[PDB]
Nucleic acid binder design. Structure first.
Ligand code: K8I
Ligand code: DG3
Ligand code: MG
Length: 639
DNA sequence: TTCCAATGACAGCCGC
DNA sequence: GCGGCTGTCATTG
């Protein structure tokens, strides 16, 4: 039967609860947030509307222990239990002793870790288990889990507990979601019971699939590193952004006025229909699609397609990068600067990490605008700055996916190239554009990068032709030459497709499985798509495993040499200059840290050493470190 | 429908 | 009319 024990209603019940809690090796917690220093709970950073009023603990059955964090105002509070006394006993039960294996189960661990630190001044110090991450680990292509989907799949007999609790079908924790008519006490108590029991079932399934070691040693520690990143945020300068915006907007104005004179009338740059009417009906250019690929061919024949492409590039930087950054910026009064607080997203097909609100991974590379034949550099990344005195440190793996592919295919030709061979992208660009390596621009090297990974991951002659600007036949010859020169790779492609067809899945270097039932499909497209996913998932997923291990191992090292706070949040939630390195961004094969001037040499050594040691392959994991006053102005730094 | 992975703005359409 | 859905366009790795 569902029972909620209000432990703070009676001194005697409270101590019995505290004694039992202190001996538990496993329990769930769920935070109780409701809509409105206050007597009735702890304000949440970023929401003037909602309070943490308590939390619920579960360690078996359908008993929730509700632990109130209200000074005044379920039976009422025993007044001998001061809030200060409760906060003591709370911090005591949520922090590890020496040689004590202790696991806390939290739905949306990251959001809960942050609220406990910033709102209640409590830093969790135990092993963490998030059922959302366990779901992902069992099927990475599953829809993002909700409490409702977890209970549906893993605890279906308890679905009645969720009847009339419609917010259980949203992504946000039932306890944290104060946009309900149900009390935080009831919501957190139900969640605590559903999550504890759900996690027992998820742990049995992880053990059956042999993913429990991955879950405890890589994925949950990776979530802890991402919690520190989300507490840290990334520094942002508005002055740099505005000055770039003004140059961009001037170019957009000139492009529009010239486009409209060539067209003969106004047209919307955002309507494919309008652009198609102008290009194909009203100018009779040869084709109706208005894609990048189409306009890229046609720019050789008339100026308007090129103007369209530049309009979309610059409009993208203004409306999808500047507008959201200058809206999501937040004053940090301790560091004395604006920062952006993006949200990590780990539920991906291959185990990459991405970001939302906003997605800082998508901030444009440097690009050039010409006006009156004078070039202006647009560096959106230059707006992302360290705290005063600090530096940005970036460490990137050199061709990690190629090194992993070499290791798994034992391809002797690819190993030679990686051992000595110059930049492969520059080599391809040179051969293609009839030049020696040195002339390649950034844009052209990116085109060659797309060609090289494209071919490796099963790009066809029609598409390679559009990209290289050559006939399908010439592209098909290029594909054959690749396959002939690197026969190891081609054997590994056929051996991976054969093994996928048999098993219904592929596995990464750490044992994670992706299910590709399209592999058996009779439809030629769906079959070929699955075969391409099979090959790409093993290499891209393996790379994502290595970067996670690197991230986790760097964080351990930083915290040993840590005579200082493990995140900027740990100073906010505390209430003496900044020392150490702060994880600020992940870019798939690249880690960014914000580092105090004094510590950049030591942090650069730790980061490089730990990234190069993450795993042992047939080939060396090469790491380049760069350093600078912004993400946009990073310079090579020999470590 | 023929590189893979990702987020997100933005016209435009359709059952409610 | 209105929110959901669905391409389509962009960008990054
Ligand atoms: C101009 C052009 C276009 C398209 C293809 C190729 N071919 C068949 C290659 O061989 C090219 C260059 O001749 C040497 C690098 N290179 C590589 N290409 C691929 C696809 C792949 C690789 C790699 F996997 F080995 F890295 C290399 C290299 N090295 C060439
Ligand atoms: N399938 C595919 N994977 C890509 C593509 N671009 C990048 N990736 C994957 C493979 C490389 C990895 C990291 O991308 P980078 O741009 O850093 O590539 P890199 O090979 O490391 O180049 P660089 O030397 O500039 O760091 O992401 C692409 O167009 N297709
Ligand atoms: Mg790289």
């Amino acid at each position: 039967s569902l029972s909620i024990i209000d432990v703070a209603s009676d001194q005697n019940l409270f101590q019995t609860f505290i004694k039992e809690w202190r001996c538990k090796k496993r329990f769930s917690i769920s935070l109780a947030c409701e809509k409105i220093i206050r007597d009735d709970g702890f304000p949440i950073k970023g929401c003037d509307d909602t309070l943490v009023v308590g939390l619920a603990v579960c360690w078996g059955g359908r008993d929730a222990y509700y632990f109130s964090l209200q000074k005044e105002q379920p039976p009422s509070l025993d007044p001998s239990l001061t809030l200060k006394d409760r906060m003591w006993y709370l911090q005591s039960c949520l922090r590890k002793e020496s040689d004590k294996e202790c696991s806390v189960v939290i739905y949306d661990f990251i959001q809960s870790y942050k609220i406990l630190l910033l709102s209640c001044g409590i830093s969790l110090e135990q092993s963490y288990e998030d059922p959302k991450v366990a779901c992902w680990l069992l099927d990475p292509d599953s829809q993002e889990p909700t409490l409702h989907s977890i209970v549906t799949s893993f605890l279906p007999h308890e679905l009645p507990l969720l009847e009339g609790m419609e917010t259980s079908q949203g992504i946000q924790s039932l306890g944290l979601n104060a946009g309900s008519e149900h009390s935080g006490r009831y919501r957190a108590s139900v969640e605590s019971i559903l999550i504890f029991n759900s996690m027992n079932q998820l742990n049995s399934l992880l053990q059956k699939e042999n993913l429990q070691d991955v879950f405890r040693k890589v994925e949950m520690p990776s979530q802890y590193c991402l919690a520190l990143l989300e507490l840290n945020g990334i520094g942002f300068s508005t002055a740099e952004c505005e000055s770039q915006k003004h140059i961009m907007q001037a170019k957009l104005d000139a492009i529009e006025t010239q486009a409209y004179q060539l067209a003969g009338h106004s047209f919307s740059f955002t309507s494919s229909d309008d652009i198609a009417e102008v290009l194909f009906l009203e100018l009779k250019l040869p084709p109706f699609s208005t894609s990048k690929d189409v306009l890229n061919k046609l720019k050789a024949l008339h100026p308007l397609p090129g103007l369209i492409l530049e309009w979309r590039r610059i409009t993208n930087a203004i409306t999808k990068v500047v507008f959201p950054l200058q809206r999501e910026k937040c004053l940090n009064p301790f560091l004395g600067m604006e920062r952006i607080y993006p949200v990590s997203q780990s539920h991906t097909a291959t185990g990459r990490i991405t970001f939302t609100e906003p997605n800082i991974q998508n901030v444009p590379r440097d690009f050039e605008i010409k006006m009156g034949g004078m070039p202006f550099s647009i560096s959106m990344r230059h707006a992302f700055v360290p705290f005063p005195g600090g530096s940005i440190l970036a460490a990137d793996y050199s061709q990690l996916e190629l090194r992993i592919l070499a290791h798994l295919s034992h391809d002797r030709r690819l190993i030679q190239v990686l051992n000595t061979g110059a930049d492969v992208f520059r080599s391809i660009a040179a051969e293609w554009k009839m030049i020696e390596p040195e002339s390649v621009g950034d844009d052209l090297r990116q085109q060659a990068k797309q060609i090289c990974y494209g071919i490796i991951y099963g790009m066809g002659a029609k598409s390679l032709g559009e990209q290289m600007g050559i006939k399908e036949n010439d592209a098909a010859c290029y594909i054959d030459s690749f396959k002939s020169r690197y026969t190891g790779i081609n054997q590994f492609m056929t051996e991976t497709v054969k093994n996928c067809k048999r098993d219904g899945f592929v596995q990464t270097i750490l044992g994670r499985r992706r299910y590709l039932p399209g592999i058996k499909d009779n439809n030629p497209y769906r079959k070929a798509h699955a075969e391409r996913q099979a090959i790409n998932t093993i290499v891209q997923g393996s790379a994502a495993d290595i970067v996670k291990i690197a991230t986790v191992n760097i964080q351990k090292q930083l915290e040993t040499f840590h005579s200082t706070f493990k995140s900027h949040g740990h100073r906010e939630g505390m209430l003496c200059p900044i020392r150490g390195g702060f994880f600020i961004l992940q870019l798939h094969d690249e880690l960014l840290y914000e580092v105090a001037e004094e510590d950049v040499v030591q942090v650069a050594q730790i980061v490089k050493n730990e990234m190069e040691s993450a795993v042992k392959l047939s080939v060396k994991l090469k790491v380049k470190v760069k350093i600078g006053a912004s993400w946009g102005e990073l310079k090579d730094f020999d470590v």
